[PDB]
Amino acid sequence: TCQHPEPLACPVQCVEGCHAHCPPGKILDELLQTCVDPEDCPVCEVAGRRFASGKKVTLNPSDPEHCQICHCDVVNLTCEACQEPG
Amino acid sequence: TCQHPEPLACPVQCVEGCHAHCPPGKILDELLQTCVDPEDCPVCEVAGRRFASGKKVTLNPSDPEHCQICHCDVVNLTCEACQEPG
């Protein structure tokens, strides 16, 4: 989905219920109930690598000197500065 | 003295007792009972201004951004880094 573009660990094979079926070239987002083209997803790709659609997590806690954080809210190709402990 | 090179607020004009009298060019320090030349005083002058012989006080509490602290133990021309609150 636009919210979960990546595949997830899938404990359940399939499930009942209402399922939005529309032709390809369109990915489902729940807020705008219909399916929509992929580009309309608020998807995030900062410094190249593939990941989720801008999860709200502060990556890289481990190393202070390598504290090179890059959040993404919806679309922004931004990177934030780390506050030094010293 | 080497311990109190600056003049102090002096509630008493003069006092009785034993008083170390020696020729000038020598300042009294109590640990080494005699009077000694001024340079032998563990005197402190960090970044130029005149003050005491390295008092053990953390100057400048007021402004965080101007937290530019400079202690002096006996002789050292040192300045310490302030720990940021953030």
Short mmCIF file of all heavy atoms in Angstrom, two decimals, chain A residues 37-85:
data_model
loop_
_atom_site.label_atom_id
_atom_site.label_comp_id
_atom_site.label_asym_id
_atom_site.label_seq_id
_atom_site.Cartn_x
_atom_site.Cartn_y
_atom_site.Cartn_z
N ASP A 37 -2.66 5.62 -8.31
CA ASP A 37 -1.38 5.34 -8.95
C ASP A 37 -0.26 5.38 -7.91
O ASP A 37 -0.39 6.03 -6.87
CB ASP A 37 -1.11 6.35 -10.06
CG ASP A 37 -2.06 6.20 -11.23
OD1 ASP A 37 -2.53 5.07 -11.48
OD2 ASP A 37 -2.35 7.22 -11.88
N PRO A 38 0.86 4.69 -8.16
CA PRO A 38 1.91 4.61 -7.13
C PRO A 38 2.53 5.95 -6.76
O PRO A 38 2.80 6.19 -5.58
CB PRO A 38 2.96 3.69 -7.76
CG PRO A 38 2.20 2.88 -8.74
CD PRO A 38 1.17 3.80 -9.30
N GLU A 39 2.76 6.83 -7.74
CA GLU A 39 3.43 8.11 -7.46
C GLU A 39 2.67 8.95 -6.45
O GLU A 39 3.30 9.71 -5.70
CB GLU A 39 3.62 8.89 -8.77
CG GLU A 39 2.34 9.41 -9.46
CD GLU A 39 1.69 8.35 -10.33
OE1 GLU A 39 2.04 7.16 -10.18
OE2 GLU A 39 0.82 8.71 -11.15
N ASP A 40 1.35 8.82 -6.39
CA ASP A 40 0.55 9.56 -5.43
C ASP A 40 0.76 9.09 -4.00
O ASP A 40 0.30 9.76 -3.07
CB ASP A 40 -0.93 9.44 -5.80
CG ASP A 40 -1.26 10.17 -7.09
OD1 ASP A 40 -0.59 11.18 -7.40
OD2 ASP A 40 -2.19 9.74 -7.80
N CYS A 41 1.43 7.96 -3.80
CA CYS A 41 1.76 7.53 -2.46
C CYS A 41 2.78 8.49 -1.85
O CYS A 41 3.77 8.84 -2.50
CB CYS A 41 2.35 6.12 -2.49
SG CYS A 41 1.26 4.83 -3.15
N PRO A 42 2.59 8.95 -0.59
CA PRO A 42 3.67 9.69 0.06
C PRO A 42 4.82 8.76 0.42
O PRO A 42 5.00 8.37 1.58
CB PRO A 42 3.00 10.29 1.29
CG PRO A 42 1.89 9.38 1.59
CD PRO A 42 1.39 8.89 0.27
N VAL A 43 5.59 8.39 -0.59
CA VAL A 43 6.66 7.41 -0.46
C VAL A 43 7.98 8.15 -0.27
O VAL A 43 8.15 9.28 -0.74
CB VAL A 43 6.69 6.47 -1.69
CG1 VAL A 43 7.03 7.22 -2.98
CG2 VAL A 43 7.63 5.31 -1.47
N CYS A 44 8.91 7.51 0.44
CA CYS A 44 10.18 8.12 0.82
C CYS A 44 11.34 7.24 0.38
O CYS A 44 11.34 6.03 0.61
CB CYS A 44 10.24 8.35 2.32
SG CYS A 44 9.08 9.59 2.88
N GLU A 45 12.33 7.87 -0.26
CA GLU A 45 13.59 7.23 -0.63
C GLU A 45 14.68 8.27 -0.45
O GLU A 45 14.97 9.04 -1.37
CB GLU A 45 13.54 6.71 -2.06
CG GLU A 45 12.57 5.57 -2.31
CD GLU A 45 12.56 5.15 -3.76
OE1 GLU A 45 13.21 5.82 -4.58
OE2 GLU A 45 11.90 4.14 -4.08
N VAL A 46 15.30 8.29 0.73
CA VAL A 46 16.34 9.26 1.06
C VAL A 46 17.70 8.60 0.91
O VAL A 46 17.95 7.51 1.45
CB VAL A 46 16.13 9.85 2.47
CG1 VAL A 46 16.23 8.80 3.58
CG2 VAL A 46 17.09 11.01 2.71
N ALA A 47 18.59 9.26 0.16
CA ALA A 47 19.93 8.77 -0.16
C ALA A 47 19.91 7.37 -0.78
O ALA A 47 20.82 6.56 -0.55
CB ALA A 47 20.84 8.80 1.08
N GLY A 48 18.87 7.08 -1.56
CA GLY A 48 18.92 5.98 -2.51
C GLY A 48 18.26 4.68 -2.11
O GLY A 48 17.56 4.07 -2.93
N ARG A 49 18.46 4.22 -0.87
CA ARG A 49 18.04 2.87 -0.54
C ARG A 49 16.52 2.76 -0.43
O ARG A 49 15.82 3.73 -0.15
CB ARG A 49 18.72 2.38 0.75
CG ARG A 49 18.22 2.93 2.10
CD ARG A 49 18.76 4.31 2.39
NE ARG A 49 18.50 4.73 3.77
CZ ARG A 49 18.71 5.95 4.24
NH1 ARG A 49 19.20 6.90 3.46
NH2 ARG A 49 18.44 6.23 5.51
N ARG A 50 16.03 1.55 -0.65
CA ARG A 50 14.61 1.25 -0.59
C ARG A 50 14.20 0.99 0.85
O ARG A 50 14.83 0.19 1.55
CB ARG A 50 14.30 0.05 -1.48
CG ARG A 50 12.84 -0.42 -1.51
CD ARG A 50 11.93 0.57 -2.21
NE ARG A 50 11.49 1.62 -1.30
CZ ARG A 50 10.81 2.70 -1.68
NH1 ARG A 50 10.47 2.89 -2.95
NH2 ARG A 50 10.47 3.59 -0.76
N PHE A 51 13.13 1.65 1.29
CA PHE A 51 12.57 1.40 2.61
C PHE A 51 11.09 1.80 2.58
O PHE A 51 10.52 2.03 1.51
CB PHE A 51 13.36 2.14 3.69
CG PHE A 51 13.33 3.63 3.57
CD1 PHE A 51 12.36 4.38 4.22
CD2 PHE A 51 14.28 4.28 2.81
CE1 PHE A 51 12.34 5.76 4.10
CE2 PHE A 51 14.26 5.64 2.69
CZ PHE A 51 13.29 6.39 3.33
N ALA A 52 10.48 1.89 3.75
CA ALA A 52 9.06 2.15 3.86
C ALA A 52 8.74 3.58 3.41
O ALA A 52 9.61 4.35 2.99
CB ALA A 52 8.59 1.92 5.30
N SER A 53 7.46 3.93 3.51
CA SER A 53 6.97 5.24 3.07
C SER A 53 7.14 6.28 4.19
O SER A 53 6.18 6.87 4.68
CB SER A 53 5.52 5.13 2.63
OG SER A 53 4.99 6.39 2.27
N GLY A 54 8.39 6.49 4.57
CA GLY A 54 8.71 7.48 5.58
C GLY A 54 8.18 7.13 6.95
O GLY A 54 7.32 7.84 7.48
N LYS A 55 8.69 6.05 7.54
CA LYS A 55 8.30 5.71 8.90
C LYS A 55 8.82 6.77 9.86
O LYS A 55 9.86 7.39 9.64
CB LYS A 55 8.82 4.33 9.28
CG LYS A 55 10.34 4.21 9.34
CD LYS A 55 10.74 2.79 9.68
CE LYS A 55 12.25 2.65 9.77
NZ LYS A 55 12.91 2.85 8.45
N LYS A 56 8.08 6.96 10.95
CA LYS A 56 8.39 8.01 11.92
C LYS A 56 9.26 7.44 13.04
O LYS A 56 8.87 7.35 14.21
CB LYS A 56 7.09 8.61 12.46
CG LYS A 56 6.46 9.64 11.52
CD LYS A 56 5.82 8.99 10.30
CE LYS A 56 5.10 10.00 9.43
NZ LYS A 56 4.59 9.38 8.18
N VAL A 57 10.47 7.05 12.65
CA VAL A 57 11.44 6.41 13.53
C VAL A 57 12.76 7.16 13.39
O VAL A 57 13.15 7.56 12.29
CB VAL A 57 11.62 4.91 13.20
CG1 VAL A 57 12.70 4.26 14.06
CG2 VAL A 57 10.30 4.17 13.39
N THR A 58 13.45 7.34 14.52
CA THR A 58 14.80 7.89 14.53
C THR A 58 15.78 6.74 14.36
O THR A 58 16.15 6.07 15.33
CB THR A 58 15.06 8.67 15.81
OG1 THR A 58 14.10 9.73 15.92
CG2 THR A 58 16.47 9.28 15.84
N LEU A 59 16.21 6.50 13.13
CA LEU A 59 17.20 5.48 12.83
C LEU A 59 18.53 5.78 13.53
O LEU A 59 18.73 6.84 14.13
CB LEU A 59 17.42 5.39 11.31
CG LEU A 59 16.44 4.58 10.45
CD1 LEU A 59 16.47 3.10 10.81
CD2 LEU A 59 15.02 5.14 10.55
N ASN A 60 19.44 4.80 13.47
CA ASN A 60 20.83 4.94 13.89
C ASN A 60 21.00 5.50 15.31
O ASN A 60 21.50 6.62 15.46
CB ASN A 60 21.55 5.83 12.88
CG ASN A 60 23.06 5.83 13.06
OD1 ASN A 60 23.60 5.16 13.94
ND2 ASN A 60 23.74 6.60 12.23
N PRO A 61 20.60 4.78 16.37
CA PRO A 61 21.02 5.20 17.72
C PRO A 61 22.44 4.83 18.10
O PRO A 61 22.99 5.45 19.03
CB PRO A 61 20.04 4.46 18.64
CG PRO A 61 18.88 4.17 17.80
CD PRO A 61 19.42 3.90 16.44
N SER A 62 23.06 3.86 17.43
CA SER A 62 24.20 3.16 18.02
C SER A 62 25.43 4.07 18.14
O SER A 62 25.88 4.36 19.26
CB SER A 62 24.55 1.93 17.18
OG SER A 62 24.99 2.30 15.88
N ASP A 63 25.96 4.53 17.02
CA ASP A 63 27.26 5.19 17.00
C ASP A 63 27.06 6.70 17.00
O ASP A 63 26.35 7.21 16.12
CB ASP A 63 28.04 4.76 15.77
CG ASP A 63 29.48 5.23 15.79
OD1 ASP A 63 29.88 5.91 16.75
OD2 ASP A 63 30.22 4.92 14.83
N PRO A 64 27.64 7.46 17.95
CA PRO A 64 27.50 8.92 17.87
C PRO A 64 28.17 9.53 16.65
O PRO A 64 27.57 10.38 15.98
CB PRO A 64 28.14 9.41 19.17
CG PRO A 64 28.04 8.26 20.10
CD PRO A 64 28.23 7.05 19.24
N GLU A 65 29.41 9.13 16.35
CA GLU A 65 30.15 9.75 15.25
C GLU A 65 29.48 9.50 13.90
O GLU A 65 29.59 10.34 13.00
CB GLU A 65 31.59 9.25 15.24
CG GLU A 65 32.45 9.71 16.43
CD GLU A 65 32.26 8.87 17.68
OE1 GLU A 65 31.51 7.88 17.64
OE2 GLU A 65 32.88 9.21 18.71
N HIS A 66 28.79 8.37 13.75
CA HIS A 66 28.04 8.03 12.55
C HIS A 66 26.56 8.42 12.69
O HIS A 66 25.70 7.95 11.94
CB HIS A 66 28.24 6.54 12.26
CG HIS A 66 27.58 6.04 11.00
ND1 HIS A 66 28.03 6.34 9.74
CD2 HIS A 66 26.48 5.26 10.84
CE1 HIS A 66 27.24 5.77 8.85
NE2 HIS A 66 26.30 5.11 9.49
N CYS A 67 26.23 9.32 13.62
CA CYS A 67 24.84 9.74 13.75
C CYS A 67 24.50 10.58 12.54
O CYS A 67 24.64 11.81 12.56
CB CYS A 67 24.60 10.51 15.05
SG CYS A 67 22.85 10.86 15.40
N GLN A 68 24.10 9.91 11.46
CA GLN A 68 23.72 10.54 10.20
C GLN A 68 22.25 10.17 9.97
O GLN A 68 21.94 9.21 9.27
CB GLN A 68 24.61 10.05 9.05
CG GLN A 68 24.32 10.70 7.69
CD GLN A 68 24.56 12.19 7.69
OE1 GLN A 68 23.61 12.98 7.71
NE2 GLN A 68 25.82 12.59 7.69
N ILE A 69 21.37 10.96 10.56
CA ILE A 69 19.95 10.63 10.57
C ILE A 69 19.29 11.24 9.34
O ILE A 69 19.66 12.32 8.88
CB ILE A 69 19.28 11.11 11.88
CG1 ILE A 69 17.86 10.56 12.01
CG2 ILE A 69 19.24 12.64 11.99
CD1 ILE A 69 17.77 9.10 12.21
N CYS A 70 18.29 10.52 8.82
CA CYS A 70 17.51 11.02 7.69
C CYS A 70 16.07 10.53 7.86
O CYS A 70 15.74 9.41 7.48
CB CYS A 70 18.10 10.56 6.36
SG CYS A 70 19.74 11.23 5.99
N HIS A 71 15.24 11.39 8.44
CA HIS A 71 13.81 11.12 8.50
C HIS A 71 13.17 11.43 7.15
O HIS A 71 13.78 12.02 6.25
CB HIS A 71 13.14 11.96 9.58
CG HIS A 71 13.57 11.62 10.97
ND1 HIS A 71 14.66 12.21 11.58
CD2 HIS A 71 13.06 10.76 11.88
CE1 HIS A 71 14.79 11.72 12.80
NE2 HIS A 71 13.83 10.84 13.01
N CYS A 72 11.91 11.02 7.02
CA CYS A 72 11.09 11.46 5.90
C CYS A 72 9.64 11.42 6.34
O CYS A 72 9.12 10.35 6.67
CB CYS A 72 11.29 10.59 4.66
SG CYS A 72 10.31 11.16 3.27
N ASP A 73 8.99 12.58 6.33
CA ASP A 73 7.61 12.66 6.80
C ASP A 73 6.66 12.02 5.80
O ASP A 73 6.00 11.01 6.11
CB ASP A 73 7.24 14.12 7.06
CG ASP A 73 7.97 14.71 8.25
OD1 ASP A 73 8.31 13.95 9.18
OD2 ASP A 73 8.21 15.93 8.24
N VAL A 74 6.57 12.59 4.60
CA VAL A 74 5.72 12.05 3.54
C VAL A 74 6.53 11.92 2.25
O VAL A 74 6.55 10.85 1.63
CB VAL A 74 4.45 12.91 3.36
CG1 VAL A 74 3.61 12.85 4.62
CG2 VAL A 74 4.73 14.38 3.04
N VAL A 75 7.19 13.01 1.84
CA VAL A 75 7.88 13.08 0.56
C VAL A 75 9.29 13.63 0.69
O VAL A 75 10.13 13.35 -0.19
CB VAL A 75 7.06 13.95 -0.42
CG1 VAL A 75 7.76 14.17 -1.77
CG2 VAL A 75 5.68 13.34 -0.65
N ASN A 76 9.60 14.38 1.74
CA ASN A 76 10.80 15.21 1.78
C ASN A 76 12.08 14.39 1.70
O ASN A 76 12.23 13.35 2.36
CB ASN A 76 10.82 16.07 3.04
CG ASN A 76 10.46 15.29 4.30
OD1 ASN A 76 10.30 14.07 4.24
ND2 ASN A 76 10.30 15.98 5.43
N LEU A 77 13.02 14.89 0.90
CA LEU A 77 14.35 14.31 0.77
C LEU A 77 15.30 15.04 1.73
O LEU A 77 16.29 15.65 1.33
CB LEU A 77 14.81 14.42 -0.68
CG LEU A 77 16.16 13.83 -1.11
CD1 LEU A 77 16.16 12.35 -0.91
CD2 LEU A 77 16.45 14.15 -2.56
N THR A 78 14.96 14.95 3.01
CA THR A 78 15.63 15.72 4.05
C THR A 78 16.50 14.82 4.92
O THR A 78 16.35 13.60 4.94
CB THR A 78 14.62 16.47 4.95
OG1 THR A 78 15.33 17.31 5.86
CG2 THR A 78 13.71 15.50 5.73
N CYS A 79 17.43 15.46 5.63
CA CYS A 79 18.21 14.80 6.66
C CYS A 79 18.45 15.79 7.79
O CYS A 79 18.82 16.94 7.55
CB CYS A 79 19.54 14.27 6.12
SG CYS A 79 19.37 12.92 4.92
N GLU A 80 18.23 15.33 9.02
CA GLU A 80 18.30 16.18 10.20
C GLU A 80 19.67 16.07 10.85
O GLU A 80 20.40 15.09 10.67
CB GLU A 80 17.20 15.80 11.20
CG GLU A 80 15.79 16.11 10.71
CD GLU A 80 15.21 15.06 9.78
OE1 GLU A 80 15.87 14.02 9.54
OE2 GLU A 80 14.09 15.28 9.27
N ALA A 81 20.03 17.11 11.59
CA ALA A 81 21.31 17.17 12.28
C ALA A 81 21.18 16.55 13.66
O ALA A 81 20.18 16.75 14.35
CB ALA A 81 21.80 18.62 12.39
N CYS A 82 22.20 15.79 14.06
CA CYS A 82 22.21 15.17 15.38
C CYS A 82 22.77 16.14 16.42
O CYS A 82 23.76 16.83 16.18
CB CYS A 82 23.05 13.89 15.37
SG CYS A 82 22.35 12.55 14.37
N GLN A 83 22.12 16.18 17.57
CA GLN A 83 22.59 17.00 18.69
C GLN A 83 23.76 16.29 19.35
O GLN A 83 23.65 15.13 19.76
CB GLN A 83 21.46 17.24 19.68
CG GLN A 83 20.29 18.04 19.13
CD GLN A 83 20.65 19.47 18.79
OE1 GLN A 83 21.42 20.11 19.51
NE2 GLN A 83 20.12 19.97 17.69
N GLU A 84 24.89 17.00 19.47
CA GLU A 84 26.08 16.38 20.03
C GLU A 84 25.93 16.23 21.55
O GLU A 84 25.35 17.10 22.20
CB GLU A 84 27.32 17.22 19.71
CG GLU A 84 27.68 17.27 18.24
CD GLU A 84 28.89 18.13 17.96
OE1 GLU A 84 29.38 18.79 18.90
OE2 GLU A 84 29.36 18.14 16.80
N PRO A 85 26.45 15.15 22.14
CA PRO A 85 26.38 15.05 23.61
C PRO A 85 27.32 16.00 24.33
O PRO A 85 26.98 16.48 25.41
CB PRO A 85 26.74 13.58 23.88
CG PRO A 85 27.59 13.19 22.73
CD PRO A 85 27.05 13.94 21.55
#
